Design a binder for this molecule. Structure first.
Ligand SMILES: CCCCCCCCCCCCCCCCCC(=O)OC[C@H](COP(=O)(O)OCCN)OC(=O)CCCCCCCCCCCCCCCCC
Ligand SMILES: CCCCCCCCCCCCCCCCCC(=O)OC[C@H](COP(=O)(O)OCCN)OC(=O)CCCCCCCCCCCCCCCCC
Ligand SMILES: CCCCCCCCCCCCCCCCCC(=O)OC[C@H](COP(=O)(O)OCCN)OC(=O)CCCCCCCCCCCCCCCCC
Ligand SMILES: CCCCCCCCCCCCCCCCCC(=O)OC[C@H](COP(=O)(O)OCCN)OC(=O)CCCCCCCCCCCCCCCCC
Ligand SMILES: CCCCCCCCCCCCCCCCCC(=O)OC[C@H](COP(=O)(O)OCCN)OC(=O)CCCCCCCCCCCCCCCCC
Ligand SMILES: CCCCCCCCCCCCCCCCCC(=O)OC[C@H](COP(=O)(O)OCCN)OC(=O)CCCCCCCCCCCCCCCCC
Ligand SMILES: CCCCCCCCCCCCCCCCCC(=O)OC[C@H](COP(=O)(O)OCCN)OC(=O)CCCCCCCCCCCCCCCCC
Ligand SMILES: Nc1ncnc2c1ncn2[C@@H]1O[C@H](COP(=O)(O)OP(=O)(O)O)[C@@H](O)[C@H]1O
Lengths: 319, 139, 100, 51, 47, 54, 42, 459, 97, 344
């Protein structure tokens, strides 16, 4: 694995970086046709387009990559999020906390690809933009105040270490038009979502996310019309100058340490498991032991990658 | 230092005055040292407040010193048996009680009595059996 | 509230496996976990053990001493010696502190 | 010795055990026959009293 | 398989040969040392 | 005599004696001046321990 | 039908706090930030 | 004695290597035979103790126990196959191994020549026991119970460590054989009067004395059945075995330094026996029964008359077997009832006919019915105690009357009276439950036929 | 010399009492700390000079060279502190409590 | 760190103790101590968090004044004996200074306040070096001069440390500080036998190093500075729960494990030398150390604390492995007791 040995002997990120190599996130409301833009921009500069973080994004990330059972993936339902807001069990907060962990894994995987291959990164919504969902959830009855504090504490502990998005794109369509966009896409859980809740999501971006990041990175606001025109947006990205931002000080000997972090997923989310016992987050020892003693028995997961024979690994007796 | 040692030279139960004086001093000395650490760390709020604490600790310690000395000497006098851990225990017993009072707690007097007295008794035994503390390396 | 499992009930292992012997849920392991426990437990420890322990010979010499007494009592009585003399270590061997 | 290699673990311990306990004797063999109560003289064609 | 392949799937064949080969050098030096030692002991003393 | 008197005396008391002793020894401001002074006191006492037992 | 009692949240709570046996004042003490970095600034 | 031990160690490899489904039978079947090899030590056709080798010895006092220590591992593993059958297949193999190490360690401790070998192995047995009690303990309070079991033994243990290193310097070897054939006569100083207390106190603590016995009621309450069997049958007796081998030295002081303990024990015997009379938890009552019947033992290992000692050896082996039997049947009621309360579960004989016969015989062993080694034991300690002072019969006479009352009350309010209306219906008795009992009592019947084997060193 | 050697030694103890009794600014301490190194340097040089022990003069200077860097490290910590608090008072160094 | 700087520093942090040990001219022993002081300070502030600057500024002042006191002892000796090194004739006060000073750098007894605080603000890694490769240097200087030091003081610093360490540890819940406190305690035993049998100090140290180095690489495997954090070990990595259990009970003196030997032979040597007063009190409060060790045992192993849902996410990802050293130093430490005779 990458180490100071490799750094000492060549393997420097600096010499692998090029103009097209940046961390570009595109953030929008629940429905901004964001997906297309990203894949489009991705297609433009060959940028590895990372999909929006999912409940089982981590399982697709690890081992076989087949989707995990819900309880193995933290028992989070976006579906139940919508049909049962302010639920007794709090699936909505557990959904949000797992989502933050998933993008933490996605952002870290993205940074690892960026510093190793040197190909730039498009990851849709980012950890920085995740807060808008929680702000809106606390604005209504979805989450209580402490729940907010617990997310903020995890965010303050883990997000600063990772370097900021080079530029952020904002595909904005008004509160009413996204709900009609919602109305025609087929899922019924997305439908019937609060107009005021959608109001709080985009308002939270405009009030906090874009100004905040307006110095940390090159924010590119785009209206819907500019959108659906990947060519134009792509053009503008190729147009902005990547100057302002903390990325300027990343010398090779500084990148090495950041790389070795993202290279270690177990650390990336080390502070995501901090022992703060808010009730929704708590596994519980008896349920948690069963869930672990069950997730660990899945084929290829009992032992470390390369050593479990079930999936067809061989040479274990000499590894 | 020739002083403190004197306590041991004269047979126990005899010349209680000297005994009580010496014991009172040792306690008081400990009081000063104890107050000092208590003031250096966990400081006070005003110089006077701390001077008071020094006094409080010094007196309390001086008291435990006195009663220990007095009780042990007298217990031996009245009992007429000079060499007996019990004399000291009664003394340590008393000493603890003074500490308990100064701290205004019956419970402390309990632990104080038992623990303190036992310790003093062991001192007597130690002297009687010639136990050596902090010994030079003789391997 | 935090997440934890709902109380697990204890199964009536006697509902299935109506021949349950108390060792394990699946029937063959049970049968073979009593056919080997009654056997190694009772059949060759309580039986072979008691046989061997019963046949330990003259344990702690108490079968030897009821004869040695008999020939000593036979010998001492016929030769007129006291059956249990009153000093064991002979007085001659002892070198008592002379002065005291 | 297949699928029966876990039944011959304990038994084997016994043998090894007996191998050591009869080896301890070999070490503690002074006073082999030099004890007072049991100091017989070697019977013809017998190497040592107790082995 | 795995989306992210293991780094250990096919053996580090160097790690075998310096692990196996090292141990066989240990023994051949160790057993040598003993018999050699026994001799030195015998000759240095009576036998 | 069982429960309270034989549990308050031997098992519980020893529990309390320590608990209280840790509370005083570990309640420290964290300020360096205080701590350091204590180093001063120590030097003084050790200077004496040698002096009087010269 | 048995659940050896595994510790609940409350049993866990005590072990939090910057001192196990909190004193009257030391009770005020607050656990140090997990990141080992503090918020103070001015 | 490395067949009683090496084959034992190999059990550990078998519990781990063996199949999850077959792990239980390989381990239980093999240690039954391990007990059969243990029986060979009983072949003493002469008085000379059997010094197997430098470190390992077995004399009349240890031999009756080594066999019991080997015997209970099979039983312990049979009584814990139910609870611990809900585990993950690696928690079991840990519990089985923990039980295996206890007798490996206990077999060695009872079969150890060097007294400090006793100490290292003596205090090691706490590690396996604390894990068995704390990790698998059902109640919320086992963390507490574990603390009590570790500290009371540990605070007693370090004084013994200092004392034994002390005698090694004073005499020059801690070898029980030599220490016996050498002149170690304490000199009744004030210091020696402390040495004696240092050596005996650690042993007196795990042998619950009236003053320090609170650890045992708390420990057996939340301990799993296998841990409670081990604590009552072998663990507490470690303290007695120690007092027999350590008082060979410190010969003069115990003549006058024992009064304090003797009186603590005999008055303790009465009060511990009496509180059994109104205690709602059955496991609680058996535990205090264990304290009282062990208070008799510390009052015979201190009077130090030949009869006391073998009264002690008789009672320790006998009470060990009886107590487990009581703790084992208490568990069978606990698992179906799901509560330790004595008042619930009334009338069981009506629904569990045989377990009640086992309950009756266990209680008759608990009280002193005469054709039992249990009575021979008490009859002998009683005799010597009477010799020490004729008045002792009064206190050892209030205990006999109380012991009869609580022993029968356990039978009268648990196994007689009208049946409880409808507790969770009580499933019939497994054959394992009944054998685990039969395995305890059939040896109690066989030993009573020839008491000579468990008579101690004295006789 | 015997007389003087006393003054220097007490100078080191007066400097000792100084560094072991802080008051506000740290730079004072570090400064005091240096007062000792001067007293040690002076005493080492003095005895070496009146023992005519020239083989040892290297030491009086090695003492200063190591002491200078030691102080360099000390001041960089000091600058680091009045960059994080900007007041350099031993008073605010209490987060570790 | 520019890898070059990393090398220079690390070399100094390593040349620092080595010069001390190898040289006999005390002066050269002092600069060995001086380097160690200079090399450790850069690493201590690597995060450069506000807590860190506090740590280093304390460590440095405590280390610096002690270094100056050690130099004063060498300077004074130079005038009481022309030699640059302590000798039979050395004035008693000259040696006592060296004991106090060196007991400050090692942080024993009434000077035990800096260590717990610097152990709290430095990373787990630099915590190990600050606890174990920085104790070798000063101890070397003491072990060399043992014939001449005072039996009384050492014992007082020894006993005090044992008590302070134990009592301090009972209350602490931060792991870094629990270890800092343990080190104070073990350091105490070590300095107790120095006047009598230095060779045992070197055993009570190695065993402490072979015990603490695995224990800390355990704390950082999951980088848990909280007991609550180490308690969820069962979910993050279940196997280390078994050995973490034995190593911590080994750190305290419980008899089957390797940890008993250092306490056992130190007690045997002190009783051989007749300190049956001192040895007894030390062993007794030594038992207090195990109480806080077992309280941690409870939280981490014997009882399973509740975990957060995101812990399932960290399980998914492959856990970066613990270096081999953990194993080799966990076993050689948890169970070597059967081989004690050859160790001593
Ligand atoms: C003739 C009989 C002589 C008996 C002598 C010994 C007992 C003397 C008791 C005198 C009264 C003491 C008392 O009342 O204080 C109890 C003490 C403090 O209790 P507290 O909660 O502060 O409230 C007291 C309010 N007045 O709480 C304590 O700490 C009591 C400590 C001493 C306990 C003495 C009795 C212990 C019995 C142990 C039996 C073990 C078997
Ligand atoms: C003669 C017989 C002597 C018997 C001595 C028994 C010692 C152990 C009894 C039980 C001690 C105990 O339970 O410690 C608890 C105490 C507080 O800690 P915690 O467990 O959190 O609080 C529970 C309070 N019951 O934890 C503590 O503060 C330390 C408790 C003592 C640990 C051993 C101390 C030995 C000191 C020797 C000097
Ligand atoms: C080994 C086994 C030893 C068994 C000894 C048994 C003694 C039992 C005595 C009766 C019980 C007394 C008790 O447990 O009280 C605990 C006491 C309660 O608090 P309180 O007395 O109100 O004062 C608080 C001061 N912080 O808590 C305290 O007061 C703690 C502070 C006072 C400590 C008193 C003992 C000092 C001993 C000094 C010995 C010097 C040599
Ligand atoms: C040694 C074993 C005993 C250790 C404790 C001795 C007494 C320490 C003490 O009394 O300090 C008190 C201080 C807290 O003070 P405060 O909170 O006011 O407590 C009063 C409660 N009613 O607590 C503190 O300030 C911290 C502990 C102070 C003592 C530190 C160590 C003192 C060592 C004394 C001997 C030193 C010998 C040096 C030889 C060179
Ligand atoms: C107790 C000693 C057990 C020795 C067993 C030797 C055979 C073996 O390899 O077992 C290792 C034991 C079980 O391993 P395994 O069979 O894979 O099943 C459990 C997986 N954790 O897993 C072990 O490592 C047991 C030994 C742990 C280390 C302490 C040994 C004393
Ligand atoms: C609690 C349960 C009961 C524990 C009893 C502990 C008793 C003290 C520890 C062991 C005492 C001991 O070993 O006794 C003998 C020793 C002196 O014996 P001796 O070899 O005769 O020395 C004089 C040489 N002319 O005498 C001593 O060791 C005196 C020990 C002084 C310290 C007592 C214990 C303090 C504990 C804190
Ligand atoms: C002198 C005797 C000293 C004491 C010996 C007996 C105690 C040994 C130490 C036990 C300390 C820990 C107690 C609590 C352990 C909890 C273990 C647990 O919770 O299970 C999970 C753990 C790891 O799990 P994993 O192997 O990855 O797979 C299963 C995933 N659920 O599962 C595991 O950890 C499995 C491996 C556990 C270690 C096996 C040890 C077996 C027992 C060793 C006995 C040695 C006896 C030596 C006798 C010497 C006599 C001279
Ligand atoms: N933190 C969050 N909390 C709740 N829902 C979220 C969060 N992050 C993303 N989502 C979900 O993502 C959905 C939007 O994704 P969508 O735009 O459909 O993906 P695509 O980019 O493929 O079109 C929303 O319905 C929203 O519920």
């Amino acid at each position: 694995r990458y180490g100071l040995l490799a750094a000492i002997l060549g393997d420097k990120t600096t010499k692998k970086l090029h103009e097209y190599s940046r961390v570009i996130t595109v953030d929008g409301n629940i429905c901004s046709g964001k997906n297309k833009l990203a894949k489009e921009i991705a297609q433009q500069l060959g940028m590895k387009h990372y999909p929006e973080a999912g409940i089982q994004y981590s399982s697709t990330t690890t081992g076989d990559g087949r989707p995990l059972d819900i309880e193995f993936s933290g028992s989070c339902s976006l579906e139940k999020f919508y049909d049962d807001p302010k639920s007794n069990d709090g699936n909505s907060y557990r959904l949000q906390s797992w989502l933050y962990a998933s993008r933490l894994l996605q952002y870290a995987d993205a940074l690892e690809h960026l510093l190793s291959t040197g190909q730039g990164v498009v990851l849709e919504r980012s950890i920085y933009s995740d807060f808008v969902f929680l702000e809106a959830m606390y604005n209504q009855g979805y989450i209580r105040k402490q729940c907010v504090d617990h997310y903020n504490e995890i965010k303050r502990l883990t997000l600063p270490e990772y370097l900021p998005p080079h530029a952020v794109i904002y595909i904005d369509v008004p509160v009413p038009e996204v709900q009609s966009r919602i109305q025609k896409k087929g899922d019924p859980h997305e439908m019937k979502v609060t107009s005021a809740y959608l109001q709080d999501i985009e308002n939270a971006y405009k009030k906090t996310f874009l100004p905040k990041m307006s110095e940390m990175c090159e924010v590119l606001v785009y209206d819907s019309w500019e959108a659906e025109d990947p060519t134009k947006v792509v053009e503008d990205i190729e147009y902005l100058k990547y100057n302002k931002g903390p990325w300027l000080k990343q010398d090779d000997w500084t990148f090495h340490y950041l790389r070795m972090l993202v290279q270690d997923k177990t650390e990336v989310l080390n502070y995501t498991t901090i022992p703060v016992y808010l009730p929704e987050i708590t596994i519980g020892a008896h349920q948690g032991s069963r869930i672990y003693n069950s997730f660990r028995e899945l084929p290829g997961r009992k032992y470390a990658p390369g050593y479990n024979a079930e999936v067809g690994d061989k040479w274990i007796w000499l590894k | 230092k020739r002083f403190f040692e004197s306590y041991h030279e004269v047979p126990d139960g005899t010349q209680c005055h000297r005994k009580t004086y010496i014991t009172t001093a040792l306690g008081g000395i400990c009081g000063i040292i104890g107050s000092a650490y208590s003031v250096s760390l966990n400081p006070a709020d005003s110089t006077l407040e701390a001077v008071a604490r020094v006094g409080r600790y010094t007196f309390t310690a001086a008291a435990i010193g006195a009663m220990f000395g007095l009780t042990t000497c007298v217990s031996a006098q009245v009992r007429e048996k000079p060499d007996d851990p019990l004399n000291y225990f009664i003394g340590g017993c008393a000493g603890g009680l003074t500490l308990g009072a100064r701290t205004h707690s019956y419970g402390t007097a309990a632990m104080g009595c038992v623990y303190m007295g036992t310790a003093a008794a062991l001192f007597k035994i130690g002297k009687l059996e010639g136990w050596e503390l902090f010994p030079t390396p003789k391997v | 509230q935090w997440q934890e499992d709902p109380e697990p009930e204890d199964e009536n292992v006697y509902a299935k496996n109506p021949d349950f012997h108390g060792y394990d849920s699946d029937p063959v392991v049970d049968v073979w976990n009593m056919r080997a426990v009654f056997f190694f437990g009772f059949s060759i420890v309580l039986v072979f053990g008691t046989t061997f322990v019963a046949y330990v010979p003259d344990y702690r010499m108490q079968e030897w001493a009821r004869r040695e007494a008999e020939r000593l009592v036979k010998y001492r009585e016929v030769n007129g010696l006291p059956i249990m003399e009153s000093n064991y270590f002979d007085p001659s061997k002892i070198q008592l502190p002379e002065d005291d | 010795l297949r699928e029966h290699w876990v039944h011959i673990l304990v038994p084997a311990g016994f043998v090894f055990g007996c191998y050591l306990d009869r080896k301890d004797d070999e070490k503690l063999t002074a006073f082999r026959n030099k004890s007072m109560l049991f100091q017989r003289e070697l019977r013809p064609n017998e190497e040592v009293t107790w082995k | 398989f795995y989306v992210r392949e293991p780094v250990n799937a096919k053996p580090n064949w160097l790690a075998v040969g310096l692990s196996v080969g090292a141990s066989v050098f240990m023994w051949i030096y160790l057993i040598q040392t003993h018999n050699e030692d026994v001799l030195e002991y015998k000759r240095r003393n009576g036998l | 005599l069982d429960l309270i008197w034989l549990e308050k005396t031997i098992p519980k008391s020893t529990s309390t004696l320590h608990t209280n002793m840790t509370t005083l020894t570990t309640n420290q401001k964290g300020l360096i001046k205080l701590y350091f002074m204590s180093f001063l006191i120590n030097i003084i006492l050790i200077i004496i321990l040698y002096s009087i037992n010269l | 039908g048995a659940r050896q009692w595994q510790p609940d949240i409350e049993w866990a709570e005590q072990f939090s706090g910057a001192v196990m046996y909190p004193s009257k004042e030391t009770a005020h003490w607050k656990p140090p930030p997990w990141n080992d970095v503090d918020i103070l600034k001015e | 004695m490395l067949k009683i031990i090496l084959p034992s160690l190999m059990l550990l490899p078998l519990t781990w290597l063996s199949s999850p489904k077959k792990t239980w039978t390989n381990v239980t079947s093999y240690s039954f035979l391990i007990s059969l090899t243990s029986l060979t030590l009983l072949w003493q056709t002469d008085e000379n103790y059997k010094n197997f080798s430098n470190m390992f010895s077995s004399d009349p006092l240890s031999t009756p126990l080594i066999i019991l220590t080997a015997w209970l591992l099979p039983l312990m593993l049979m009584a814990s196959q139910n609870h611990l059958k809900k585990d993950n297949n690696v928690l079991q193999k840990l519990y089985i191994s923990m039980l295996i190490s206890l007798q490996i360690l206990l077999i060695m401790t009872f079969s150890a020549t060097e007294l400090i070998m006793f100490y290292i192995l003596f205090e090691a047995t706490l590690i396996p026991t604390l894990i068995i009690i704390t990790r698998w303990g059902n109640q919320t309070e086992r963390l507490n119970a574990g603390i009590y079991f570790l500290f009371y033994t540990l605070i007693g243990s370090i004084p013994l460590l200092i004392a034994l290193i002390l005698i090694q310097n004073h005499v020059g070897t801690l070898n029980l054989m030599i220490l016996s054939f050498t002149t170690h006569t304490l000199d009744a100083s004030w210091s020696n009067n402390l040495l004696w207390l240092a050596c005996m106190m650690a042993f007196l603590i795990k042998m619950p004395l009236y003053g320090v016995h609170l650890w045992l009621p708390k420990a057996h309450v939340e301990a799993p059945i296998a841990g409670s069997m081990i604590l009552a049958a072998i663990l507490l007796k470690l303290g007695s075995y120690g007092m027999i081998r350590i008082s060979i030295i410190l010969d003069p002081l115990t003549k006058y330094m024992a009064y304090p303990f003797i009186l603590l024990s005999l008055w303790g015997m009465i009060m511990t026996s009496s509180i059994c009379l109104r205690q709602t938890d059955l496991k609680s009552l058996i535990a205090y029964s264990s304290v009282s019947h062990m208070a008799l033992v510390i009052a015979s290992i201190m009077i130090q008359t030949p009869w006391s000692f073998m009264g002690a050896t008789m009672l320790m082996i006998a009470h060990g077997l009886t107590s487990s039997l009581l703790f084992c049947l208490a568990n069978s009621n606990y698992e179906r009832i799901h509560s330790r309360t004595m008042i619930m579960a009334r009338g069981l004989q009506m629904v569990f006919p045989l377990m009640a016969t086992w309950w009756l015989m266990a209680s008759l062993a608990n009280l002193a019915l005469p054709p039992s080694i249990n009575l021979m034991g008490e009859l002998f300690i009683t005799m010597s105690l009477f010799s020490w002072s004729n008045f002792t019969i009064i206190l050892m006479g209030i205990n006999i009357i109380i012991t009869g009352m609580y022993s029968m009350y356990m039978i009268i309010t648990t196994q007689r009276g009208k049946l409880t209306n409808h507790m969770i219906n009580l499933q019939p008795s497994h054959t394992r439950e009944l054998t685990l009992m039969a395995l305890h009592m059939i040896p109690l019947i066989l030993l009573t036929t020839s008491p000579k084997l468990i008579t101690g060193l004295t006789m | 010399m015997p007389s003087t050697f006393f003054n220097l030694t007490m100078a080191f103890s007066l400097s000792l009492l100084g560094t072991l009794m802080f008051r506000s600014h740290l730079m004072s301490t570090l400064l005091c700390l240096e007062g000792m190194v001067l007293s040690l340097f002076i005493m080492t040089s003095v005895t070496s000079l009146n023992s005519n022990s020239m083989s040892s003069m290297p030491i009086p200077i090695t003492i200063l060279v190591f002491a200078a860097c030691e102080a360099a490290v000390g001041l960089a910590l000091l600058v680091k502190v009045s960059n994080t608090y900007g007041t350099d008072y031993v008073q605010n160094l209490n987060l570790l409590q | 760190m520019n890898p070059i700087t990393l090398a220079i520093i690390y070399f100094t942090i390593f040349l620092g103790p080595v010069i001390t040990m190898s040289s006999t001219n005390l002066m050269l022993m002092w600069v060995g101590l001086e380097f160690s002081l200079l090399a450790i300070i850069p690493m201590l502030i690597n995060k450069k968090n506000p807590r860190s600057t506090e740590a280093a500024t304390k460590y440095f002042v405590t280390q610096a004044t002690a270094s100056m006191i050690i130099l004063l002892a060498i300077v004074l000796n130079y005038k009481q004996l022309g030699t640059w090194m302590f000798q039979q004739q050395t004035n008693g006060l000259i040696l006592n200074m060296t004991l106090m000073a060196l007991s400050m750098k090692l942080g024993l007894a009434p000077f035990h306040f800096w260590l717990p605080e610097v152990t709290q603000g430095i990373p787990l890694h630099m915590g190990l070096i600050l606890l174990t490769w920085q104790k070798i240097a000063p101890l070397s200087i003491l072990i060399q001069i043992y014939p001449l030091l005072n039996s009384t003081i050492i014992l007082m610093l020894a006993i005090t440390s044992i008590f302070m360490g134990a009592w301090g540890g009972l209350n602490q819940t931060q792991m870094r500080k629990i270890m800092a406190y343990s080190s104070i305690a073990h350091m105490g035993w070590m300095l107790a036998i120095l006047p009598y049998n230095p060779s045992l100090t070197l055993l009570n140290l190695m065993i402490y190093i072979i015990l603490t180095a695995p224990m800390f690489m355990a704390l950082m495997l999951n980088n848990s500075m909280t007991i609550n954090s180490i308690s969820l070990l069962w979910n993050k990595t279940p196997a280390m729960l078994t050995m973490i259990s034995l190593m911590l009970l080994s750190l305290g003196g419980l008899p089957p494990l390797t940890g008993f030997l250092p306490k056992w032979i130190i007690i045997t040597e002190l009783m051989k030398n007749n300190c049956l007063i001192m040895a007894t009190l030390m062993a007794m409060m030594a038992l207090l150390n195990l109480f806080f060790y077992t309280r941690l045992i409870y939280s981490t192993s014997l009882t399973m604390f509740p975990t957060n849902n995101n812990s399932k996410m960290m399980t998914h990802q492959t856990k970066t492995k613990p270096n081999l050293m953990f194993s080799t130093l966990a076993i050689m430490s948890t169970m070597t007791l059967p081989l004690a005779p050859q160790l001593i």
